[PDB]
């Protein structure tokens, strides 16, 4: 929503801050390969889950599309493309926990996060609970 952006491709290299743990909720989709998760795939997986376990619990989208994916309108090369074909893209490296469902039981969570991984372009693991923690 701010500072100037038709920003570059970057490169989806090594993942360490790209992937720490699951913080919110109990269960979590977690990526196993670096890929560009669009806003459309975020909304698609999230409305797969919330409609799967209907009126259910909390589904924290810990990623956020913050990168203008740019697409030229089928022509040659004069400058950057018009920007944001479907919109923005969360640059996701592996080990990153993308979605977390909260409180809803394992039978809905494992058959919801699997649907989210089926609409996402990344081969995923699904983590249960009891990750990295810090408190005494």
């Amino acid at each position: 929503r701010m500072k100037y952006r038709k920003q570059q491709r970057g490169r989806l290299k090594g993942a360490t801050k790209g992937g720490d743990y699951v913080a919110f909720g109990d269960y979590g989709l977690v990526a196993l390969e670096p890929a560009w998760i669009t806003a459309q795939q975020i909304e698609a997986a999230r409305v797969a889950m919330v409609r799967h376990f209907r009126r259910g619990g909390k589904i924290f989208i810990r990623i956020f599309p913050d990168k203008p994916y740019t697409k030229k309108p089928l022509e040659v090369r004069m400058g950057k493309g018009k920007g944001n074909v479907e919109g923005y893209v969360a640059v996701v490296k592996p080990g990153r926990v993308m979605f977390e469902v909260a409180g809803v039981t394992e039978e809905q969570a494992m058959e919801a996060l699997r649907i989210a991984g089926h609409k996402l372009p990344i081969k995923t693991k699904i983590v249960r609970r009891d990750a990295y923690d810090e408190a005494q």
């Binding site: 309108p73 089928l74 022509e75 040659v76 004069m78 400058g79």
Partner: peptide, 11 residues
């Protein structure tokens, strides 16, 4: 069918 142009602004 060269169906475009584009006015660059940042060179």
């Amino acid at each position: 069918h060269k169906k475009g142009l584009g006015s660059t602004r940042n060179g």
